[PDB]
Amino acid sequence: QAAQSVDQLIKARGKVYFGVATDQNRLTTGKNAAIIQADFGQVTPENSMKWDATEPSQGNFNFAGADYLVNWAQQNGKLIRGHTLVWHSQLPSWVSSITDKNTLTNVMKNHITTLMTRYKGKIRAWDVVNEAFNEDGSLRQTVFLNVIGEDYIPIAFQTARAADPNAKLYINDYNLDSASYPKTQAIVNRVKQWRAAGVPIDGIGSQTHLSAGQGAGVLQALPLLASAGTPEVAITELDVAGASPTDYVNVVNACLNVQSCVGITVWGVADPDSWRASTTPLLFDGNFNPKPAYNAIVQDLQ
Numbered sequence: 001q002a003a004q005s006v007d008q009l010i011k012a013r014g015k016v017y018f019g020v021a022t023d024q025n026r027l028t029t030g031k032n033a034a035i036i037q038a039d040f041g042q043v044t045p046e047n048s049m050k051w052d053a054t055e056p057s058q059g060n061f062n063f064a065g066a067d068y069l070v071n072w073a074q075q076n077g078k079l080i081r082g083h084t085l086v087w088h089s090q091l092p093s094w095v096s097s098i099t100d101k102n103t104l105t106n107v108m109k110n111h112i113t114t115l116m117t118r119y120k121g122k123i124r125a126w127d128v129v130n131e132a133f134n135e136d137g138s139l140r141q142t143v144f145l146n147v148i149g150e151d152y153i154p155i156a157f158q159t160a161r162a163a164d165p166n167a168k169l170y171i172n173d174y175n176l177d178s179a180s181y182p183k184t185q186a187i188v189n190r191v192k193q194w195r196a197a198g199v200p201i202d203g204i205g206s207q208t209h210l211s212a213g214q215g216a217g218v219l220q221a222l223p224l225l226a227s228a229g230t231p232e233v234a235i236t237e238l239d240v241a242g243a244s245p246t247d248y249v250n251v252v253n254a255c256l257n258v259q260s261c262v263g264i265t266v267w268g269v270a271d272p273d274s275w276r277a278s279t280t281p282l283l284f285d286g287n288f289n290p291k292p293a294y295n296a297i298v299q300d301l302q
Contacts, residue, residue, distance in 0.1 A: 137186025
């Protein structure tokens with residue numbers, strides 16, 4: 001654990017939190033638990049709340065891992081971002097096999113309602129729909145889009161709102177890091193349209209899985225995302241190949257510069273445990289010591 005807490009410091013700047021992705025396998029080894037307890041104020045389950053883990057068989061839910069994380073977060077006063085309710089990846093075969101509109105609709109609604117109800121009132125935000133956009137801005141042709149139609153997004157959000165009105169509902173996606181990139185501009189216009197039609201989209205989550213030098217672009221991209229008019233926007237899965245202090249600081253400033261940006265979540269604690277470890281993209285090294293990027297953020301926030 002670092003003496004200076006990025007979460008405490010970002011809170012002092014007026015933001016809600018600075019968190020990290022994690023799960024039972026992380027919290028039970030190394031210095032993960034201690035580091036998160038001292039330097040972060042929010043956690044996102046890396047995999048324990050996904051469809052493949054929570055409902056491997058229809059109507060047969062498994063909350064073992066999810067419960068572990070939620071209980072640990074509450075016991076340690078950390079905010080939680082549910083992740084993720086509707087996503088084409090890590091999707092059980094029994095779901096993708098459904099070709100009937102009514103069937104899939106009811107299945108999607110039950111999955112959403114069941115998970116959100118179990119943790120009702122204990123989740124700050126939920127990534128209701130994840131990666132629903134193609135790189136060109138069109139809607140990704142997933143089993144949900146092909147079987148339910150474009151209405152699946154509005155339905156997912158309306159269903160989530162009803163399950164737990166306390167949680168902020170987010171649509172989450174990657175490659176929303178450049179203001180001139182097609183995807184960025186598209187999600188903004190579609191979210192504007194959905195909200196205008198009454199869809200309860202409280203926020204836009206920008207994964208922000210960056211390559212070296214892409215931090216600079218976020219300075220213009222985040223404000224653009226905020227122009228969609230959602231009450232919130234957030235950096236949800238930040239990591240940067242190379243872990244350059246310049247890229248990390250740029251992303252932090254981007255959020256500081258955006259009034260509606262409530263916080264930042266980095267995708268993991270120590271490099272060896274990153275899902276992109278080959279690029280040592282995190283803020284703590286293999287020895288679980290703060291890297292130059294961590295100190296740079298602290299220095300920026302102070």
